[PDB]
Design a binder for this molecule. Structure first.
Ligand code: NA
Ligand code: NA
Ligand SMILES: [Zn+2]
Ligand SMILES: [Zn+2]
Lengths: 290, 290
């Protein structure tokens, strides 16, 4: 059923596994994520970006999740605001029924990031909602102070991905010892952003269907595995889902120019997305944890 | 808000206009239909086929509609089971919260069609839900007896479209005088099936995006207008929505092989579908009827 984000992530923190945090923008994505969690007996951490909330309406985003929870009442589910950019966006998500909110002030200096994060924490904790923040590479002693003073529930430290305020050109490299130091000093669940791991079969599906991935690479599965070993407990996953889904839409469009039954496009798209989610749950170690 | 189907169609019957009955299979179709009704100040008949219910789950089909009704509480909305094929399907739709159900037994002989329809009517009326049935071209005196004995709320008579149990080869032609006879004898709201228009702009968008419309032709807008003139009050509309929607999906796929943001595909697809709905509301006479 619907639970606070910290309930899912504290278990992962204690037991040393990662929970994929899977984005959705509509019914098809959400259904595939839930079926994957059901088939792998995995907790579900469901994310909606601010753009997804604008697209669906926050009432529909929460409403569809509540319907799905009732359909699979044995699965723990958290509903998380991904990259909230203002206090008011986080508060609206809290009021609408989200059970986790992320405030991204990582482009601000330490003091301003801490101040806004703490304000979000005060509001969210009063409503029983858990909070994620982001900090950058990160200095572990600054992360220690940031966590202790803010009371944030989980932190996304900049540890080597090209993402957000910490974009760089070049092969990403995981700073494992830095990760371990952040983990040891903060003793909270940690979150990895910017780690798309386009599986070989998904890449092939997308290219075969005529797609172009313009030298976009993501990271190898080993990067994700090593990150979990080092204490990452939440792995944001969106890009990989979209590529798998749209590969099947492109394929249907290519192979039958007369096809306009939406279900003929979106049933195979859901299946491909579901399979990405299932494999990611197995890779990160949340399978069979419910 | 969500209302019994006959509340919407009795008004259309009394005042001589038509209400589009628009199918959905997911959130994008539903949102576009609702925005059209809001923008044209039109009542809404929202339809889900048995296949759409299996695809969404009946809990999600009803649940999404209820969310949309709360977003637009001033719009009368009926939620209708399209081409129900069994008593049990109709009963499941009643129990889930549909406010109108169609039982299609038009492939059976009169006696058996009447028996099954009458059984559905008794169950649905006991729950305050309206019922549609289908009969075929139709003999008006048989339609008269069928309506009197079954107490069905609205009837889809076979009046010249190639559809369902009444498919023929050659050009479909409205039997206007037969329609008026059925209307005079039954004196209930009447329903038109199998009348896809495929507007020129929709056809152009689909073919420009590389589609193939496999020698499928729509009935002229004149067909639809004359049908309403003759007593049609509900016009089933699905094919035209799908073509407009998928044309935009195909176009996006064609013009950017690197695109996999679902919103980039489905926002223009929603807009195209919305505009088909708005134009149909204006054509049939339900615009400005709220
Ligand atoms: Na996040
Ligand atoms: Na129908
Ligand atoms: Zn981030
Ligand atoms: Zn029919």
């Amino acid at each position: 059923m619907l639970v606070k984000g910290n309930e899912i992530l504290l278990k992962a923190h204690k037991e040393g596994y990662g929970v994929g945090a899977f984005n959705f923008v509509n019914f098809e994505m959400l259904n595939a994520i839930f079926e994957a969690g059901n088939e792998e007996n995995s907790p579900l951490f469901i994310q909606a970006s601010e753009g997804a909330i604008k697209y669906m309406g926050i009432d529909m985003a929460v409403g569809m999740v509540k319907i799905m929870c009732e359909r699979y009442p044995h699965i723990p589910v958290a509903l998380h605001l991904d990259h909230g950019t203002t206090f008011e966006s986080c508060e609206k998500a809290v009021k609408a029924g989200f059970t986790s909110v992320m405030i991204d002030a990582s482009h601000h200096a330490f003091e301003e990031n801490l101040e806004l994060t703490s304000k979000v924490v005060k509001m969210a904790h009063n409503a029983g909602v858990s909070v994620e923040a982001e900090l950058g590479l990160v200095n572990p002693k600054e992360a220690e102070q940031f966590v202790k003073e803010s009371q944030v529930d989980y932190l996304a430290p900049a540890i080597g991905t090209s993402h957000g305020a910490f974009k760089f050109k070049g092969e990403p490299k995981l700073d494992f010892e830095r990760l371990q130091e952040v983990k040891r000093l903060t003793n909270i669940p940690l979150v990895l952003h910017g780690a798309s791991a386009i599986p070989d079969n998904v890449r092939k599906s997308y290219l075969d269907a005529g797609g172009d991935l313009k030298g976009s690479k993501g990271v190898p599965f080993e990067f994700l595995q090593e990150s979990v070993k080092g204490g990452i407990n939440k792995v944001n996953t969106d890009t990989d889902l979209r590529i798998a889904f749209i590969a099947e839409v492109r394929k249907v469009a290519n192979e039958d120019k007369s096809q306009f039954d939406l279900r003929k496009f979106f049933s195979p798209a859901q299946l491909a997305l579901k399979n990405v989610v299932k494999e990611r749950m197995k890779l990160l170690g949340s399978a069979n944890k419910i």
